[PDB]
């Protein structure tokens, strides 16, 4: 029993974290095999960042412009290229702690674990959702750039995020592990702000199923809804429209609990319209949207508390 | 910026997790040097658990009654003893992944990271507070016993918790790493229930300081309070009494923000009396009590958003 935001165990990722220094900027890099991945803005000074030309700034660097430290070991750079918003530094040593890994580009609403690092040393681990507006609400201080996001699938690390910036509202932006930003953001100092966000409907529904699985049924009702009628309420409350694909995804959870998706949608519609009446769901006084249907299946018992 | 429940990176602990089997029960053990620590109730069947005599059940076992698996390696038991509610199995191999570690007995209100494990394989990591009533609100399923709690201090793992049971309300109980239970709980099937709990005042106050450090001042007021007058409100709202020791502990945070502890207590007293008025603090609609003053200093910037 119980239900907590749970991160993946971070060990496999810890063994890949390094420090990258160029001139006067230090941040974190990812060391897999003989390559270290890091944000390209490591080559920028305080003024370059205002209107940088990375092609022009980079041609001016050599292999020995880059200092890479794995623990108390210095790694020799023997090659370098830029891949979108990432630098790739080929190093003379292949990482003996390299896990089986993939690079994946995560979709909005999906979750991942973040290993927050400073100076190449892991300091903390927490679970995040990629928001509909392509930001994450992380916890990052100066020197956290190059910290990675990931999921773990058996023994395989699926890297999905590298941290690049904080936006005006204190939320975070970054790239996948090919250097392509999530969202319309760029790696330079601009007026860029997070677009407006919405609540991840599918995740709220997933989390209501988790509450039932864990033994709580108080929020259910005798009603049902059509997709279209639910979606009218959803837009009034700044929830994402529910789609038939989302209904399909909730299938396994629907079957485990014996509650039809659209019946659960009527429950949600009622919760949205009537509030929660001083009551809690899975210990929470609000409707939580940072657990996927997958996170619920991962964490909950396969058998429900009927 | 941002503020999240953050666990310690779990790698150092992952390398110590094993599977322990006795007869038909499997659970997790902790492998440090040449010793594997696990709950003693691993020797109990489904009926022993109702009125077990562990001294009597244990004398009936040999070294080869115990099967220990580290990954795909079997470890040979060459000794065994009971220490309070723990078994200690001496093994023929010393763990090469043993970190610098200590065993510590944590106090109520203190936090720690939990590495949830099943069959000796880490599955998740999350942050927990030891409640005033000596339980934790973890997330554990069957086979999670022997999963450990810990803090990390530089390179040193301070182990503080080993998981033994779930109580009637779905909250969790266990021991320190000497086998002494937190709380009045025992390792047998009884009517035992969690005593009534209270909110950890010192932690709520710590978290209000974090909110100010992160830039938010809306909940402050022009008032101050005496300890004694705050404590009258505290008992009406089932908060722990504030003590002068707790005021002293909040010193560093008080100095960083320029807000006197007792002035912050007046703010809290007002929040308790008036509610929060549809507003949020650090993204939360409720007063959070699972961050210590230490957790706030660890996570927040040393410089406040004035």
Give Cα separations from A206 to A193, A265, B221, B240 (angstroms). Answer: 30, 11, 40, 35
Q: What is the largest CA-CA distance in chain B?
A: 69
Q: CA angle, A256 as apex, A251 and A261 as ends, to 5°?
A: 40
Interface A:B, Cβ pairs < 8 A: 102
Per the structure block, which two tokens stand in for B112? 């720690």
Does the annotation count B145 as an active-site position? Answer: yes
How many angstroms separate the CA atoms of B224 and B213, rounded?
20
Radius of gyration of the CA atoms of chain B, in A: 22
The closest CB to that of B139, out of A4, A116, A137, belongs to: A4
Q: What is the largest CA-CA distance in chain A?
A: 69
Per the structure block, which two tokens stand in for B10? 């779990």
Verify whether the Cβ–Cβ distance B138 to A285 is below 8 Å: no
Sort out which chain B residues have CB atoms less than 8 A from A137's CB and list them.
2, 4, 283
The closest CB to that of B7, out of A14, A125, A301, belongs to: A125
Cβ neighbors of B68 (< 8 A, separation 6 or more) are B18, B19, B20, B21, B29, B31, B36, B74, B75, B76, B77, B89, B91
Say whether residue A3 is in contact with chain B using an 8 A CB cutoff. yes
- Nearest residue of chain B to residue A139 (CA atoms): B2
Cβ neighbours of A172 (radius 10 Å)? 27
Say whether residue A170 is in contact with chain B using an 8 A CB cutoff. yes
How many angstroms separate the CA atoms of A132 and A109, rounded?
6
Angle of helix B201-213 versus helix B261-274 axis, rounded to 10: 100
Verify whether the Cβ–Cβ distance A124 to B7 is below 8 Å: yes
The residue whose two tokens read 């909040």 is B250
Closest Cα of chain A to B242: distance in Å? Answer: 25
Sort out which chain A residues have CB atoms less than 8 A from B139's CB and list them.
1-4, 6, 299
DSSP structural state of residue B52: -
Sort out which chain B residues have CB atoms less than 8 A from A3's CB and list them.
139
| CATH code linked to domain B1-14+100-197 | 2.40.10.10
Verify whether the Cβ–Cβ distance B9 to A6 is below 8 Å: no
Active-site pick, A16, A38, A41, A44? A41
Verify whether the Cβ–Cβ distance A170 to B1 is below 8 Å: yes
Specify whether the CB–CB gap between B304 and B257 falls below 8 A: yes
DSSP structural state of residue B33: T
Adjacency order of strands within the sheet including B66-70: B73-75, B66-70, B17-22, B25-32, B35-39, B86-91, B77-83
How many angstroms separate the CA atoms of A185 and A164, rounded?
10
Report the DSSP pairing between strands B17-22 and A17-22.
unpaired
Q: Decide if B1-14+100-197 and B15-99 have a common fold.
A: yes
Angle of helix A201-213 versus helix A261-274 axis, rounded to 10: 100
Cβ neighbors of A113 (< 8 A, separation 6 or more) are A7, A8, A10, A125, A126, A127, A128, A149, A150, A151, A152
Verify whether the Cβ–Cβ distance B9 to A11 is below 8 Å: yes
The domain segmentation of chain A, as residue ranges, is 1-14+100-197, 15-99, 198-301
Closest Cα of chain B to A73: distance in Å? Answer: 17
Specify whether the CB–CB gap between A39 and A85 falls below 8 A: yes
H-type alpha helices, chain A: 11-14, 54-59, 201-213, 227-236, 244-249, 251-257, 261-274, 293-299
How many angstroms separate the CA atoms of B112 and B152, rounded?
9
Say whether residue A216 is in contact with chain B using an 8 A CB cutoff. no
Specify whether the CB–CB gap between A294 and A210 falls below 8 A: no
Quick one: which of B301, B302, B303, B299 has its CA closest to B6? B299
Per residue, the 3-state secondary structure of B276-303, as one string, reads CCCCCECCECCCCCCCCHHHHHHHCCCC
Specify whether the CB–CB gap between B171 and B194 falls below 8 A: yes
Which among A3, A6, A9, A12 is the top mutation candidate for probing chain B, defined by the most B β-carbons within 10 Å of its own β-carbon? A9
Per the structure block, which two tokens stand in for A138? 């992380």
Closest Cα of chain A to B74: distance in Å? Answer: 20
Task: Report how this structure was experimentally obtained.
Answer: X-ray
Quick one: which of B169, B208, B196, B198 has its CA closest to B288? B208
Question: Residue A211 in 3-state DSSP?
Answer: helix
Say whether residue B71 is in contact with chain A using an 8 A CB cutoff. no
How many angstroms separate the CA atoms of B50 and B199, rounded?
33
Say whether residue A303 is in contact with chain B using an 8 A CB cutoff. no
Backbone angles phi, psi at B258, to 5 degrees: 65, 15
Topology (CATH) of A198-301? main proteinase (3clpro) structure, domain 3 (1.10.1840)
How many angstroms separate the CA atoms of B31 and B103, rounded?
13
DSSP structural state of residue A195: P
Cβ neighbors of A8 (< 8 A, separation 6 or more) are A113, A150, A151, A152, B124, B125
Specify whether the CB–CB gap between B151 and B144 falls below 8 A: no
How many angstroms separate the CA atoms of A278 and B202, rounded?
25
Verify whether the Cβ–Cβ distance A2 to B123 is below 8 Å: no
Q: Does domain B15-99 have CATH number 2.40.10.10?
A: yes
Specify whether the CB–CB gap between B89 and B20 falls below 8 A: yes
Does the annotation count A145 as an active-site position? Answer: yes
Specify whether the CB–CB gap between A215 and A305 falls below 8 A: yes
Verify whether the Cβ–Cβ distance B126 to A6 is below 8 Å: yes
Distance of CA B227 to the CA centre of its chain: 28
Burial class (CB in 10 A: 0-12, 13-18, 19+), A229: middle
Specify whether the CB–CB gap between B26 and B143 falls below 8 A: yes
Question: Residue A257 in 3-state DSSP?
Answer: helix
Say whether residue A7 is in contact with chain B using an 8 A CB cutoff. yes
């Amino acid at each position: 029993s119980g239900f907590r935001k749970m991160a993946f165990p971070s060990g496999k990722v810890e063994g890949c974290m390094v420090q990258v220094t160029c001139g006067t900027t230090t941040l974190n890099g990812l060391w897999l095999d003989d390559t270290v991945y890091c944000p390209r803005h490591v080559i920028c000074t305080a003024e370059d960042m205002l209107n940088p030309n990375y092609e022009d700034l980079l041609i001016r660097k050599s292999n020995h412009s880059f200092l890479v430290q794995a623990g108390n070991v210095q790694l020799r750079v023997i090659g370098h290229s830029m891949q979108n918003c990432l630098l790739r530094l080929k190093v003379d040593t292949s990482n003996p702690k390299t896990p089986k890994y993939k690079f994946v580009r995560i979709q909005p609403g999906q979750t991942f674990s973040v290993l927050a690092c400073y100076n190449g040393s892991p300091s903390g681990v927490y679970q995040c959702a990629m928001r509909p507006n392509h930001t994450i609400k992380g916890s990052f201080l100066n020197g956290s750039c190059g910290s990675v996001g990931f999921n773990i699938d058996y023994d395989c690390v699926s890297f999905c995020y590298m941290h690049h910036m904080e936006l005006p509202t204190g939320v975070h932006a970054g790239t996948d592990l090919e250097g392509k930003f999530y969202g319309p953001f760029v790696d330079r100092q601009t007026a860029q702000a997070a677009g407006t966000d919405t609540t991840i409907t599918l995740n709220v529904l997933a989390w209501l199923y988790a509450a039932v699985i864990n033994g709580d049924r108080w929020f259910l009702n005798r009603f049902t809804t059509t997709l279209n009628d639910f979606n009218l309420v959803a837009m009034k409350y700044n929830y994402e429209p529910l789609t038939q694909d989302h209904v399909d995804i909730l299938g396994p959870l629907s079957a485990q609990t014996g509650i039809a998706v659209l019946d659960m949608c009527a429950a949600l519609k009622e919760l949205l319209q009537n509030g929660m009446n001083g009551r809690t769901i899975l210990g929470s006084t609000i409707l939580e949207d940072e657990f996927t249907p997958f996170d619920v299946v991962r964490q909950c018992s396969g058998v429900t508390f009927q």
